[PDB]
Amino acid sequence: FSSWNDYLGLATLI
Amino acid sequence: YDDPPGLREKAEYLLREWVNLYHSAAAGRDSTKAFSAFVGQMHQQGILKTDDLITRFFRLCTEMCVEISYRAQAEQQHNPTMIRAKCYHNLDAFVRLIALLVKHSGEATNTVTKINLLNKVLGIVVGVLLQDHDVRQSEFQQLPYHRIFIMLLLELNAPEHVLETINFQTLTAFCNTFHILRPTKAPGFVYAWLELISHRIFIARMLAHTPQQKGWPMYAQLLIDLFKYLAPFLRNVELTKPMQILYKGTLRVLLVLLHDFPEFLCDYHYGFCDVIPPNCIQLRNLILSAFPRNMRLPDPFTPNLKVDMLSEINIAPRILTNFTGVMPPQFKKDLDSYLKTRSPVTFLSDLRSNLQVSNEPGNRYNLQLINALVLYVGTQAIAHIHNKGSTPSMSTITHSAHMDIFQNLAVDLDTEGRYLFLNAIANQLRYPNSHTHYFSCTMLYLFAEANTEAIQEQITRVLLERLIVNRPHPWGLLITFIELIKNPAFKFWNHEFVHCAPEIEKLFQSVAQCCM
């Protein structure tokens, strides 16, 4: 990841 | 043997007659006349004459019940829950006899002889158990003794006046008995023992029924016995499958205590963490996630949460363990000296010199001493800052003897030592309190003031491994992690160990799935 928001923008279910 | 002749026949007759009575008479005047008649007959047969005869009576009864259990199992295996019901037929009968003899022993107000009789019988049963364990060895069966103990416990915890006037002492007797039968002393009884100490009613009476919480230290002692027995097995990863049963029992009782008695797990978190091996992330997490129910934890994902402005932050948690004693006297004196005068600086290299015991990988350090050192230095630091007229922060915990010790441990220790140290810090990352806050700031500062990425990646991986576990999670842990990741001052994402690795990314995804 590259940042905090980038980390929160993860797509786990896919 | 050493038994008087003809006594076995007396005991046999009496036991059988009492079983018959127990399974023939109903509650009311019948039970009372039956017990009275039976006691009278016990006096007639001259068994209550001397203490020795009473002892041998209870012992013979116990032995006969046990032999009936064995014979019942055998007869079961020979002829293809009913057998259970036979064993329990005789056993429950005998238990009823014991409880009734204890309840009506001496006067109504005289509790002394009642408790004495209880401890006497329990002791005798313990003796029979240990003898049977030493002789039968592999053929040993836990079921009868388990039945006796739990049914006696249930009987003596009945809603009755006489029984309630002696309840705590009854619980005391049973606690002592359970402690004597600890798995390190009676391995062949460990499953039944675990069943006994993790029984819901026993737990209820120990952790709630008694005021002043006099029952908490005792049950804490039982749990610590359990963890002490389990530690070397839980430490070795090749014994995961054979230890599934005991591990699941321990997990179960820890879950029970977490959901129904969190205050207890709070007050005794340090001793438990001290005994439980650091690789047991789940159990330890259950112990660390516990917080007082009269406290409301703020959401860690709250937009700009002011942690320092929380009311419970300045308050210290209660530690019911003397961690100071782990430190040797001279080392403690030198420690206090350096904490007071910040001199000499050699005391730090001497610190590594004092924490390490061996050069063997995995067993290099004294874990308890490290935990104690970390917690003590932390608390002393909090008190020191409070005495200066301020609260712990990122700019108030720095440049002092305490932080000197912390940073020195952060650099001079090897990877193993660093791991144990960082873990010793993380064990205090819990619900909002002074310890949680101070050690959060300490962890984050150690990350920030680091001169190499080694300790940084190590910290990150510690938080990561402590977060990948079933909900709930310790508040301070999640807070520390979130602060490390979100606050641009720590520049977390600009480091190399997180830039390249897809492994630590996988870990981050797991943490996102478990905690987010």
Author numbering:
A (entry chain D): 40 to 53
B (entry chain C): 1842 to 1921, 1926 to 2361
Paper text:
Nanos is a conserved post-transcriptional mRNA regulator that was first identified as being required for posterior pattern formation in the Drosophila melanogaster embryo. Although the Nanos partners vary depending on the organism and mRNA target, a common emerging partner is the CCR4–NOT deadenylase complex, which interacts with the N-terminal region of Nanos proteins in diverse organisms. The CCR4–NOT deadenylase complex plays a central role in post-transcriptional mRNA regulation by catalyzing the removal of mRNA poly(A) tails, repressing translation, and promoting mRNA degradation. The CNOT1-C region contains the NOT1 superfamily homology domain (SHD), which interacts with CNOT2–CNOT3 heterodimers to form the NOT module.
